[PDB]
């Protein structure tokens, strides 16, 4: 549940912060960053609250950041 | 070949930005990845690499073929 198996493709954990500490914007918000990973568009991807997810084959789970200047960033999930 | 207000209806063939950049064809993702797929908004005339205003933006636009400039506004003759 809370660690990473592989590239996070199946990670349904709770971490909400980027490798560098920034807090994730919520998947369901369009603020501060406008985007198209609408949860309802991809329900099977566990795009919840603001938890780091990897719904699209990226190296490790990431997220949209609340910092105006950083749209998104890789999170740091303990490899199981 | 000129436009109205905003160009939400332009179906002209101009394909350059207000700075001279050849536009990127809407059905390509090169040089720029984007989601203005024509199959998706079939009723918006995302025809070739013609400048268009599909999003109630301020005036026609397009994606640039210049890798560093994602997109620019076009200069359409007001009628």
């Amino acid at each position: 549940e809370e660690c990473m198996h592989g590239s996070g493709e199946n990670y349904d954990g709770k971490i909400s912060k980027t490798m560098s500490g920034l807090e994730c914007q919520a998947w369901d918000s369009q603020s501060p960053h406008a985007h198209g990973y609408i949860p309802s568009k991809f329900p099977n991807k566990n795009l919840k609250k603001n938890y780091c997810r990897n719904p699209d084959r990226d190296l490790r789970p990431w997220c949209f950041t609340t910092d105006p200047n950083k749209r998104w960033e890789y999170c740091d999930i303990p490899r199981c | 070949e000129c436009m109205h207000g905003s160009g939400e209806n332009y179906d002209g063939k101009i394909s350059k930005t207000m700075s001279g950049l050849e536009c990127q064809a809407w059905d390509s993702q090169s040089p720029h990845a984007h989601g203005y797929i024509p199959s998706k908004f079939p009723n918006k005339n995302l025809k070739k690499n013609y400048c268009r205003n599909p999003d109630r933006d301020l005036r026609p636009w397009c994606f640039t073929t210049d890798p560093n400039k994602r997109w620019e506004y076009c200069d359409i003759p007001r009628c």
Binding site: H33, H35 | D57, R70
Partner: peptide, 26 residues
């Protein structure tokens, strides 16, 4: 209205608009 061509058309636009402002302030 979240899953409608228009809803999406507006997001896709905000994003272009956001990406270009940021590049401005670089």
């Amino acid at each position: 209205e979240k899953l409608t061509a228009d809803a999406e058309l507006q997001r896709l636009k905000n994003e272009r608009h956001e990406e270009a402002e940021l590049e401005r302030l670089k």
